[PDB]
Each structure stands twice: as C-alpha cells, then as structure tokens.
Design a protein around this nucleic acid. Structure first.
Ligand SMILES: [Mg+2]
Ligand SMILES: [Mg+2]
Ligand SMILES: [Mg+2]
Ligand SMILES: [Mg+2]
Ligand SMILES: [Mg+2]
Ligand SMILES: [Mg+2]
Ligand SMILES: [Mg+2]
Ligand SMILES: [Mg+2]
Ligand SMILES: [Mg+2]
Ligand SMILES: [Mg+2]
Lengths: 109, 175, 62
RNA sequence: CUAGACCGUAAGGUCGGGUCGAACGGCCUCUAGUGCAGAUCUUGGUGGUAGUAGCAAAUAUUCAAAUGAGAACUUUGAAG
C-alpha cells in the first residue's frame, strides 16, 4: 500500500508498565513505544523525537502517564540506509487530555 | 600456507586465515562446526540469522550447563547459543576467502566450506584478585582460525583345480 | 569531536561551573577549532557559548 | 614422529618411510654427577572442573545529533 504514512495513536502505557519496578518505568515506556511503532508500521528502525522523550520523562522515572497520544510517521530511510528501507519517527501531540481519541490518519497535505 | 589436513583440489580451492584472534576458542569451535560443509551463501545467510537471534549455533562439545533454547530443534539439540563475537570473526574470514576465490577465478555459486578448523592460540595473561590475599589467573582463550572453500564437484581371482572344474561343469550344461 | 576541553575553558572564562556552560550543538566545528581562552572568549560574545541562567530557588513559600 | 618389518625370555638392538641439517657409531678396554612412576619430590608446561562459580553494596538512567569500520559506555544538546 502506501509505505509513507502518518497516523495518530493513543498508547495505553498503564497496561504496559503495570507491575514494573519504579527505577525503569520510564526506560521501559521508551521500549514499549518502540515495540508499539514496530507493531503498527512494521518497521524495525523506530526513532523517537527528543521532545517525546521529554513527555515520557516529564514526571520522573516513576510517573509515566497512563495514556499518551503519539504521531507515528513511517518515512523512507536514507543517508546510508540500514537493512530496512523504512523507519518510524514518533512525535508527541500536545493535547489537553489523552482520553477519548481514536486512531486517525493525518494527511501530509 | 600449511593448513590442516585437507582432501580437496588446491587448484579449485581458496583459503583464508586469522591468527591470535581474541575470541573465545570454545565458542568459535562451535560456530566453525555449524557451517562445516555448508554452501557458502547458505553459510553466510545462516550466520546473519544468528546475529538476528533467528537461528542458533548448536553447542555440541563445550556445552556443559548451557541454557536450553527452542532454536536447537533445527539440529536436534537442546543447547544452542548465539556467539556474536565468534560469528563476526568467521564471516570476516568467509568474506576474505570468497575474495580469494574471485581473485583466483573460482565460480562462487558452486562454492562450499570444505575445511574449517579452529585451534587454540597462545593465551593472554591477566590477574584476578581473590579473598584472603590470593591472586589467580584471568586468561583469554584466543583462536587460530583457518578455512578453505572449494567448488562442488560432480582384481585377479584365484581358483583351485576343483573350483575351475565346477565352473567348467556349469558352463557345458548352461543354456 | 572532543569538546570537553572547550567546556572546561568556557567555564573558567565565563566564571561559572561546567553545569552552566552551553555549547552550540549546531556549531561543533567552530567550537572544536577554538583551543585558546581568547578564542573561547570570541565564541562567548558572538553567542556560540552562552551563560545558561541559574536554576531558581524561590523564597515565596518561605 | 611412525596400530610398518626383523632379532633378543628381557634390559634392548636393528631396518624401512616422513621430518631435519652437521656431526655420529661398531668392537676391545678405562671412567662416572650413569638408567625414575611415586618422595604433600624440584622447575617449567598443560588439563578436567568450565564457557562454569561468578562480573548483584554506594537510588538511575533516557532521547536525538556528531564522530567513527564499529557507540549502552566518546562529545554536544535536551530530559530525569
Ligand atoms: Mg508486582
Ligand atoms: Mg551439569
Ligand atoms: Mg548455574
Ligand atoms: Mg544452564
Ligand atoms: Mg575477587
Ligand atoms: Mg648447519
Ligand atoms: Mg644421579
Ligand atoms: Mg617423571
Ligand atoms: Mg553463568
Ligand atoms: Mg549503585
């Protein structure tokens, strides 16, 4: 289909970080969004915006938000490309609340 | 020159070596045995899968108290590992041997690992510090590695007097 | 690049700690060439190295 | 070095092949620092154990970029 695409996802970080030790909730939330963008875009190479890292780490290593709105953009890998030709770039979307939002495709134009 | 015992055509063979390579001898031995006899491109694709943890290296000899894995079912063993450091050294030498085969003029689609042998290099010495003011050795086990690729190639009888007489008696009544 | 030396130089030149020294990540090559205190001083005035204002400790609740 | 041959009951002796490169034997006598499996023997070298025991105190790391053949660990920025 369309190998280049951008979509809005809500990740339930509450169910993914449930029962995880406190000193690695925020590092594991990093890895869960990495597995999340790999499960939705089919790309091994997942790249996280530093401002998304700020949103994960905003309330410390222990206080990752229960829900998080993400913008996952599958793009074409260049600049001495790796084994894969496509990659996922995950951005945060600034919203008042991360509740009640469904998956929606966002157009590039 | 002066490799191990090889029984192949030297004119149809290309070789590669690496000496004093600081990689575990035990793990390099099993990685070498996992591609011994395979086709070159099959062996190279398999080692890439070992790097990706899709396929494992069966640990056959130096394997006591190794963990078990599902990926040993491919070879009929419970104990198999993924010696990434050993794999990289081996596939570097496979890439060098295929370069020698190309330089020599050998046809790469028919190549296969005919001989691969990992030997113990001289060990590198370090110390470790134990309880009650004791010092013990802390020693590397490097590997001598050598491999060869080759193309895939496509009575006087004595009888007594009574034995000959029977054969004579069989013939003069046979149809 | 190893801009560790420049961050040490910028802290001593500006007069603050290394924790308050900002080096432009988009100007790595320019900071790399600056090996003298006079060259770090030149980088301070053209904005490449800034003073990174203090973390506030309010006494409003006090 | 040699699951190749011969001689001697044996200690041993002799030969063929491989490897090697500069000295070495038979016999009659002389002489000894003259024959090793042990001595928790001496010195050196190597194993099984074993890719094992383990590399768990000092709250804690994460993201991107740069450099590089290669970055969990280098540099910078952001965050905690
Ligand atoms: Mg629990
Ligand atoms: Mg056991
Ligand atoms: Mg164990
Ligand atoms: Mg085990
Ligand atoms: Mg110790
Ligand atoms: Mg000579
Ligand atoms: Mg004596
Ligand atoms: Mg002895
Ligand atoms: Mg272990
Ligand atoms: Mg600690």
């Amino acid at each position: 289909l369309k190998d280049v695409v951008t979509r809005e996802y809500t990740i339930n970080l509450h169910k993914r970080l449930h029962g995880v030790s406190f000193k690695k909730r925020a590092p594991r939330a990093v890895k869960e969004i990495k597995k999340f963008a790999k499960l939705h875009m089919g790309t091994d190479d997942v790249r996280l915006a530093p401002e998304l890292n700020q949103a994960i780490w905003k309330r410390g290593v222990k206080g990752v938000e229960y829900r998080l709105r993400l913008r996952i953009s599958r793009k074409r890998n260049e600049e001495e490309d790796a084994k894969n030709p496509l990659f996922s770039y995950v951005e945060p979307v600034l919203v008042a609340s991360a509740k009640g939002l469904q998956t929606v495709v966002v157009e590039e134009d | 020159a002066r490799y191990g015992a090889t029984s192949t055509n030297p004119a149809k063979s290309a070789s590669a070596r690496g000496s004093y390579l600081r990689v575990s001898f035990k793990n390099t031995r099993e990685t070498a045995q996992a591609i011994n006899g395979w086709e070159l491109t099959k062996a190279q694709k398999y080692l890439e899968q070992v790097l990706d943890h899709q396929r494992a290296i069966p640990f056959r000899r130096f394997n006591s108290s190794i963990g078990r894995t599902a990926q040993g079912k491919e070879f009929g063993v419970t104990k198999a590992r993924w010696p990434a450091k050993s794999v990289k050294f081996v596939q570097g030498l496979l890439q060098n041997a295929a370069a020698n085969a190309e330089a020599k003029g050998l046809d790469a689609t028919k190549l296969y690992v005919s001989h691969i042998q990992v030997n113990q290099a001289p060990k590198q010495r370090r110390r470790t510090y134990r309880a009650h003011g004791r010092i013990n050795k802390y020693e590397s086990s490097p590997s001598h590695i050598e491999l060869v690729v080759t193309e895939k190639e496509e009575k006087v009888v004595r009888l007594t007097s009574r034995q000959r007489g029977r054969i004579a008696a069989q013939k003069r009544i046979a149809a | 690049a190893n801009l560790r030396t420049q961050k040490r130089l910028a802290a001593s030149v500006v007069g603050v700690g290394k924790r308050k020294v900002w080096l432009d990540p988009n100007e790595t090559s320019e900071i790399a060439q600056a090996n003298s205190r006079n060259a770090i001083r030149k980088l301070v005035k053209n904005g490449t190295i800034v003073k990174k204002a203090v973390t506030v400790h309010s006494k409003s609740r006090t």
